[PDB]
Design a binder for this molecule. Structure first.
Ligand SMILES: *[C@@H]1O[C@H](CO)[C@@H](O)[C@H](O)[C@H]1NC(C)=O
Lengths: 50, 50, 37
């Protein structure tokens, strides 16, 4: 990863994390407090005092 | 009403009979005989696709 | 996306034509039936 002196480690994917996302993508993925998008409730989680 | 009745752990205040939720739909009820507070949940569903 | 009945999951990978959802997507391929990959 020697690109003539430029340092792309911030945008290139990070293999260590289980999600192969670069640190900037992780940051801006944690910032957005998105809702639930198509989970499989199984109807058991739905019933309860949640 | 139609649905599955289940043991709600939540506690009513003695003088009011049954609970609700966001909509004005019954979400809990006190059994007349043993005075038990119950959950209510419509049976599972979801559209099919071919 | 949900429980699908009638298709065999295959450990291969193809650019696909019938999207099912969340990455999985079925097709018709070989003794010839519907696969899901
Ligand atoms: C490149 O950036 C990474 C992450 O900030 C840093 O750990 C590393 O020391 C930098 N290396 C260079 C080429 O300066």
């Amino acid at each position: 990863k020697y690109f003539g002196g430029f340092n792309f480690s911030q945008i290139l994917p990070d293999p260590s994390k289980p999600s192969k996302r670069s640190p900037i993508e992780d940051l801006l993925f944690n910032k957005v407090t998105l809702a639930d998008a198509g989970f499989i409730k199984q109807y058991g989680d739905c019933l309860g005092d949640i | 009403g139609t649905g599955v009745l289940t043991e709600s752990n939540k506690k009513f205040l003695p003088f009011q009979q049954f609970g609700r939720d966001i909509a004005d739909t019954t979400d809990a009820v006190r059994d007349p005989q043993t005075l038990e507070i119950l959950d209510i949940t419509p049976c599972s569903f979801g559209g099919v696709s071919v | 996306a949900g429980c699908l009945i009638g298709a065999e999951y295959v450990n291969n990978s193809y650019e696909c034509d019938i999207p099912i959802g969340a990455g999985i997507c079925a097709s018709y391929q070989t003794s010839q039936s519907i696969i899901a990959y």
